[PDB]
Amino acid sequence: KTHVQLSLPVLQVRDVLVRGFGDSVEEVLSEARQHLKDGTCGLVEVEKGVLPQLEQPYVFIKRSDAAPHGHVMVELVAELEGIQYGRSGETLGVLVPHVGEIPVAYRKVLLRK
């Protein structure tokens, strides 16, 4: 399937134990896609002071369309030193590994895979 329905645990930035997916744009996009497939991916909602508490490169989920079965269609865009790899809509948040942190909410997304 080109798209997969996922329910992503929303994590508080200060709870996150593993603050990024790796060391290159290509690795973080690779690792994010693997964690999304394996159900081991969390979502941090971006506000003032969040991103500097996480590790670059960042992986964003961005709205790709204007929401089947409640699931917002999203795609992945990476960012390193202010350059983004991908073009898409509004940021829904930054992806991080999920290793058992208690979420505050769930974000239903349809991921272009």
Swiss-Prot record:
Classification lineage: Viruses, Riboviria, Orthornavirae, Pisuviricota, Pisoniviricetes
Organism this protein belongs to: Severe acute respiratory syndrome coronavirus 2
Domain of life: Viruses
Residues of the full protein shown: 11 to 125 of 7096
Cellular localization per UniProt: Host cytoplasm
Region (Disordered): 1-113
Protein name: Host translation inhibitor nsp1
Purpose of the protein: Inhibits host translation by associating with the open head conformation of the 40S subunit. The C-terminus binds to and obstructs ribosomal mRNA entry tunnel. Thereby inhibits antiviral response triggered by innate immunity or interferons. The nsp1-40S ribosome complex further induces an endonucleolytic cleavage near the 5'UTR of host mRNAs, targeting them for degradation. This inhibits the integrated stress response (ISR) in the infected cell by preventing EIF2S1/eIF2-alpha phosphorylation upstream of stress granule formation and depletes host G3BP1.
Annotated ranges, domain CoV Nsp1 globular: 2-113
